[PDB]
Design a protein around this ligand. Structure first.
Ligand code: GTP
Ligand code: GTP
Ligand code: GDP
Ligand code: GDP
Ligand code: MG
Ligand code: MG
Lengths: 29, 430, 427, 427, 429
């Protein structure tokens, strides 16, 4: 018991913003 | 001792008052913290040694805009408890601002007014800054206007309300809230000085030569008018025109009490070096329709009674020479029963310039505040929006839920219809 | 001092809400660890609207995670920006709804909606002044539709004086993801109009159309689509979190968008979207956002806005703008093409300005539009349900849990009620 | 100068009373050897409540441990913190009652209760002022029930002006640890009503779901169960041994919580119960304490407080707290739901603040509830005793040692008297 | 020379006593060691080589809080057995502190008081601090008030008492021990002044901008009330008001002596710079229910007899002008047959601010201790709780157990019914 104190590539965002939101590096076309 | 208290309700009210006390603290030389390094007595309370607090209250149902005053550049100047907040906004509803949630917050606003009036020796008038197009300004503003009328009875009250424009307006239920507010202003507000946003946008576009005007630029030069219409109390001149003079000279009838506005010298830094600004030239610019602060044509109506306050080095004679040239012009008109129509006020202190402001240092300034029958047109267009819209019972479910009744739109309709009957009748010759 | 209750339900709602708190915590400046590091002092001032203060500078969102399968719950907590969530708010079942509205709403949702009502009331009574009940779920699924709409129905009785946003996706007309969706889609609408004060209609085919035609991304994943929703979902309450020259809460939008209680369906867009090929070629100005804001390509609904007539509108501008430029374009679009707008309402469009833009973006805005074009989305679902109910196909699952065909007739009657009232307003 | 004598009886008493002496020795700051090693000087202010000064600065507890089986004292001395007890207090037997109340009370107790009142009397006049006695024994067993309650009866005859706490554990509702539990429970209740000045009830299944659902541990052992039993008893006497803003001595816990002398049975609950994986998300504020303190799940008795109202409530706050928020939270819970409180006593809830918190934690509370919902614990045992007795089941073991069924009829007569009068005051 | 013997009884007495003597040591400049680094004669006894000993007994049956003073910052200030402790406490039981456990400590209590009254030349009066809800404050407090009247008749016995709040209390037997001790308060205590805790909670949160106050924050401005009233004896002023002047001024009847309190300047340090300190609205703030020290609205009742005590640079003109305005204020109501309803006592010492205190340093101060008919509403709602409790005979067996009989419950209630009858017919026109 510790009641005294605690003491304890799937997402693929592919969207970045540089003065306008676009694509980081991956691909386009 | 002259003293005037000002109240600020609605998102228009605080943001106008942010620029109002920005110029007020600059005329008297006090630093923004609240120390001057007795014209300050009419706007500042001399608190102890070196500390001054403005004699105004800020109040808004929305807790947003109060915090940026509380965390802005005027955190130390204002009194920490004079700033009045709310749990939530009235949300463009006159029902919420007047009945449900403003009621729990109007009584905390009423007692601080009593704290302000008890501190001063002799109060002169009431200034209210609001917008009838929204919920908080129209709702709590009317709610306060009931309370101050019965408590501080028969005292002169002068109002500055930002009405909807016929073209530029930022709310759908905006014609509903203006109609419901006008049923309260006519029987209670003594003189209502009108305001409109895009007329001040237009006076920033063609005069100050800025193509990107914002709300900060409009409220900065509104404060120039407010200081000009209270410039007689602060500084000495030829003809002092106080708030007691302003009502009894300019409102002819109990239900005919609306008012225009003008401020003729509005000149940028580059434009000032070429304009020859004499009393005759600045008088002609104020009466022209392009320089007013509500978009109404005074040619369409007729002027009822006019009042002019001159600031700076104005000799008392070319002001009378300008009046004679004004009255001999056919393009300006007066109603037939008012032969004497001008009140002259001269003050000697020129308007100050805020640092970073687009207004340049001008040695002469005139503000033309006049009753007119052309204010029927800005009330006819706003009523024309309501009648076409109320025929389908649109947007009523927001209103009847929060304490209002369905029929209350009808008395507010005929009250404005009676006002339109008054404006058309009194402008008719006989 | 206002705060918004965000509640997430279903497979669709949980993954979007993972992306929603991903960008908001980044916009407010708090790391995935849980420590505030926003360098701007204006972000730290209004933190109680979406974040509860905890010991040691820690913040936990005012959000719940509600689902019937532990798969989505495990997927949210595994990735980054999922550790910040409340462990107690991770309410979960073991059965799984499985695309049946009867299971989500009545049989297997009932024994575990009392547990999710326990943590909502725990979170609601802890905070000071409640503003709204914003829900992100699905209408064509089974977990977020049946349990969400019952939770929507249950929460309206407990707090009958609060606004509510429904970030609820709609099955696309062109493609489908569930075979038995229009049984579930129509039966969620019937329980929705009686209690939802407003609806934020979304779909997926518009997000694919936005991310391919405008962003020039041939392979968009759910990271791309849910980021655009997350950009919107922060933009609706933009005026609350930050100062602005003309603020607007949820009820400011609510009064300015619905003439009537039953016409509370919207279409939503997000204006500052540039491809990386045209990254340097678009001049970011107030005229340039609004020429894309009112474009039909940028809407996040299946409806074509030019077919329908706009009933109201709303604009949530963010950043440093001159309000004359804001007000001129809104007046310009009303007079350039007034045939696409209403004739019996003056000042159709509402506007607001927030003084702080989002991260990276210098200017941004969010369009909220109640139009008659949402009828085109309803009647596509309505014509599918009638053709599928006339022979009682796929109904033995639905009637097996105690839901009679009389309710199905009542759902279609109210489905026809919406398309009756929008259509003759457009005339 | 208030001295508390601790008495442990039987297998359950000597094992879980050891862990009560574990936490007090850990909180007052004395080592397993017996010397002081605390940080602050506040601990040494009131040591005389529980310990005796001796040679070399050693502190020997004012505890007498007594049972009929020798197996427990093999376990008591061998465990940690087991050396501190005086061996003269380690009086034991050789036969063992074996879950029989008759052997403990009459047959094999009679040659030993005369011995244990010699040991108690030696530590009685050794100290200055007896505040009273506290006992923690078992009711389902027999070596701490029959042998214990005879001691409880005998010390009230000798020392009638002193006060009694009985931290008695009752049989669990859904599971049973011993077959003959309903007999030994009801025969112990009949003696504990007129002899014990107040009683606090602990239930193992009430501890079981707490240690799993709220403490989020997969497999708590018995030591984890006894810790919350040990934690609550230290919260009973927190205001005695330490200063505070408002002090509640143990006589205050009697005179305030007990409206009528028969209505003295309580229920207890430890407030700050958060797991290791959920502590850092939770903000340690007194609103978070009061919501957990009044929760039904947090109580350590078999009763559910939504069934019956609280006649009188208490709260033993420990630490540096703002008493305005403490006062207004109890006012709020009295105003949020006045149905769940007894109406004919205004302001039912008592609060007292001890200025020092326990070890590690900084803000804690200990709820004492004289609720009328605990008649369900009486009634479920009472219906078990009637059903077992009406076939004279398991009776030749009891009546063979010097019992007759007259007391068993009398034991029921006080058992159903309690549930009748507890229900009477609820109405 | 002038002298008052402050007597604090019970746990609540110690915490207001630890705060009062924290204020008295600053305003006279008494170091916690007890040595100065004329006016101290009324509160301190100069002995030996410049050593100052307080004229106060801290008697309480619980040995815990009194031992905190023995281990606090003020170890060398108070005389050791001048503080008095008992072996065991009463635990909010009236019968304990009055009959069975208090009777063996009263003989030690009056032994110290007799030696305290012996050393002082002229004892101007007694100051009593207790709480009715506490068993020591009710039980031991009554038997001290009984024996003090027998030994020292006709001497002033000024009393400040902590009544339970209507909304908030911390014992269910507080309605019992309140009116049971109140029966002893009518016949013996000359002037009783009420202090109510939840009213102080509103004052701290509305005016002192402390969102989370504690008892130490409550007792510091409770102590500021006490120092303002006794400030006339300590420091010379424009019109001194002694304690003997106080009893003859606001006691119209020997039964009607329960009066309220108020303290005007209540602002924080950051809020003091913006507020204008002037006795115009400082006097108006005292008559507001916000500054009211007892949670009862004064505009339901009528202010019967009022006393104003003023500190600092208050000129006597504008205080006499502010009295003229508040008399004309129809919101404040006075009884018709007492047209003179004010006492104007001004002292020339501004209050001293404690380090770490919530209050700001101010130049002017008002203490409005006033008899009124709205204080009977406190006794009525205290009586209304007693009808519910006594009808079902709850918590009686301890009261009858410890020597005390049962018939005094009818006798204690009969006295409180006599008070509420008197407060109604006298206040009537
Ligand atoms: N000139 C000027 N007008 C303003 C300013 N701020 C707001 N307004 C006007 O106020 C109108 C909105 O009405 P308000 O009453 O101020 O809105 P509100 O105060 O937030 O009230 P709610 O919307 O109900 O919360 C807008 O149409 C603006 O024209 C300002 O700073 N300057
Ligand atoms: N205003 C104020 N009231 C206090 C303070 N401390 C305790 N009290 C009050 O005292 C009441 C408790 O009764 P006490 O007088 O403290 O009890 P006691 O003196 O210990 O007497 P026994 O409990 O019988 O030993 C609480 O309800 C509080 O309202 C304090 O510092 N300030
Ligand atoms: N935008 C978006 N939509 C999703 C996501 N996950 C699922 N959906 C939508 O959810 C719909 C299917 O719903 P379903 O999985 O049955 O929801 P359920 O009831 O929770 O099981 C599909 O039309 C998807 O478009 C996501 O991560 N992002
Ligand atoms: N918490 C806890 N309870 C126990 C423990 N041992 C026994 N009990 C309780 O005591 C009852 C059985 O006790 P028992 O050993 O028969 O007592 P005895 O034989 O008379 O000394 C059961 O109902 C248990 O709930 C223990 O180690 N911890
Ligand atoms: Mg507003
Ligand atoms: Mg005490």
């Amino acid at each position: 018991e510790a009641a005294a104190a605690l003491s304890a590539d799937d997402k693929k965002y592919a969207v970045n913003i540089e003065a306008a939101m676009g694509q980081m590096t991956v691909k386009d076309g | 001792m002259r003293e005037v208290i000002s109240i600020h309700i609605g998102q228009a009210g605080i943001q106008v008052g942010n620029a109002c006390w920005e110029l007020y603290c600059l005329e008297h030389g006090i630093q923004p913290d609240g120390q001057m390094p007795d014209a300050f007595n009419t706007f500042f309370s001399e608190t102890g040694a070196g500390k001054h607090v403005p004699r105004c209250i800020f109040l808004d149902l929305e807790p947003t805009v109060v915090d940026e005053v509380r965390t802005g550049t005027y955190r130390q100047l204002f009194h920490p408890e004079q700033l009045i907040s709310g749990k939530e906004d009235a949300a463009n509803n006159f029902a919420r601002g007047h009945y449900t949630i403003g009621k729990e917050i109007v009584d905390l606003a009423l007692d601080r007014i009593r704290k302000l009036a008890d501190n001063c020796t002799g109060l002169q008038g009431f200034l209210v800054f609001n917008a009838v197009g929204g919920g908080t300004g129209s709702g709590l503003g009317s709610l306060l206007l009931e309370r101050l009328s019965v408590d501080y009875g028969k005292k002169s009250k002068l109002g500055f309300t930002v009405y909807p424009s016929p073209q530029v307006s930022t709310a759908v239920v905006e014609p509903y809230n203006s109609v419901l507010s006008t049923h309260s202003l006519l029987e209670h507000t003594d003189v209502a000085v009108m305001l409109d946003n895009e007329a001040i946008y237009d006076i920033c576009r063609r005069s100050l030569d800025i193509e990107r005007p914002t709300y900060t630029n409009l409220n900065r030069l509104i404060a120039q008018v407010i200081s000009s219409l209270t410039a007689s109390l602060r500084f000495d001149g030829a003809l002092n025109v106080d708030i007691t003079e302003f009502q009894t000279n300019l409102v002819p009838y109990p239900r005919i009490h609306f008012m225009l506005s003008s401020y003729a010298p509005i000149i940028s830094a580059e434009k000032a070096y070429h304009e020859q600004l004499s009393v005759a030239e600045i008088t002609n610019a104020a009466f022209e329709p392009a320089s007013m602060m509500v978009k109404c044509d005074p040619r369409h109506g007729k002027y009822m009674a006019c009042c002019l306050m001159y600031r700076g080095d104005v000799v008392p004679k070319d002001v009378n020479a300008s009046v004679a040239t004004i009255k001999t012009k056919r393009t300006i008109q007066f109603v037939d029963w008012c032969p004497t129509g001008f009140k002259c006020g001269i003050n000697y202190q020129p308007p100050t310039v805020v640092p970073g402001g687009d207004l340049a240092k001008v040695q002469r300034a005139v503000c033309m505040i006049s009753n007119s029958t052309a204010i029927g047109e800005i009330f006819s267009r706003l009523d024309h929006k309501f009648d076409l819209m109320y025929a389908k019972r649109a947007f009523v479910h927001w209103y009847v839920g929060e304490g209002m009744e369905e029929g209350e739109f009808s008395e507010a309709r005929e009250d404005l219809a009676a006002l339109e009957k008054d404006f058309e009748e009194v402008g008719a010759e006989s | 001092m206002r705060e918004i209750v965000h509640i997430q339900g279903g497979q669709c709602g949980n993954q979007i809400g993972a992306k929603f708190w991903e960008v908001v915590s980044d916009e407010h400046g708090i790391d995935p660890t849980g420590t505030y590091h926003g360098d701007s002092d204006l972000q730290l001032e209004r933190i109680n609207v979406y974040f509860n203060e905890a010991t040691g500078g820690r913040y936990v969102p005012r959000a719940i995670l509600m689902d019937l399968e532990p798969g989505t719950m495990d997927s949210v907590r595994s990735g980054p920006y999922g550790q910040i969530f409340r462990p107690d708010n991770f309410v979960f079942g073991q059965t799984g709804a499985g695309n049946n509205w009867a299971k989500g709403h009545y049989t297997e949702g009932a024994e575990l909606i009392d547990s999710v009502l326990d943590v909502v009331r725990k979170e609601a009574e802890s905070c000071d002044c409640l503003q709204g009940f914003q829900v992100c779920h699905s209408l064509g699924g089974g977990t977020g539709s049946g349990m969400g709409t019952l939770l929507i129905s249950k929460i309206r009785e407990e707090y009958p004086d609060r606004m509510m946003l429904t970030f609820s996706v709609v099955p696309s007309p062109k493609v489908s993801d569930t075979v038995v969706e229009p049984y579930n889609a129509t039966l969620s609408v019937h329980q929705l109009v009686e209690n939802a004060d407003e609806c934020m209609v979304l779909d997926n085919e518009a997000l694919y159309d936005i991310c391919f035609r405008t962003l020039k991304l041939t392979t968009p994943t759910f990271g791309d689509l849910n980021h655009l929703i997350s950009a919107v979902m922060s933009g609706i309450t933009c005026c609350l979190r930050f100062p602005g020259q003309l603020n607007a809460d949820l009820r400011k939008l609510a009064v300015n968008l619905i003439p009537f209680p039953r016409l509370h369906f919207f279409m939503v867009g997000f204006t500052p979207l540039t491809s990386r090929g045209s990254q340097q070629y678009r001049a970011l100005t107030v005229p340039e956002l609004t020429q894309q804001m009112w474009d039909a390509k940028n809407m996040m609904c299946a409806a074509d806005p030019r077919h329908g007539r706009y009933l109201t509108a709303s604009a949530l501008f963010r950043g440093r703008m001159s309000t004359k430029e804001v007000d001129e374009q809104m007046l310009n679009v009303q007079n350039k093409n007034s045939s696409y707008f209403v004739e019996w309402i003056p000042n159709n469009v509402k506007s607001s300005v927030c003084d702080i833009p989002p991260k990276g973006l210098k200017m941004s805005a969010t369009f909220i539009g109640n139009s008659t074009a949402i009828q085109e989305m309803f009647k596509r679902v309505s014509e599918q349900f009638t053709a599928m109910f006339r022979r009682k196909a796929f109904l033995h699952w639905y009637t097996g849990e105690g839901m009679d065909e009389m309710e199905f007739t009542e759902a279609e009657s109210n489905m026809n009620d919406l398309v009756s009232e929008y259509q003759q307003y457009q005339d």
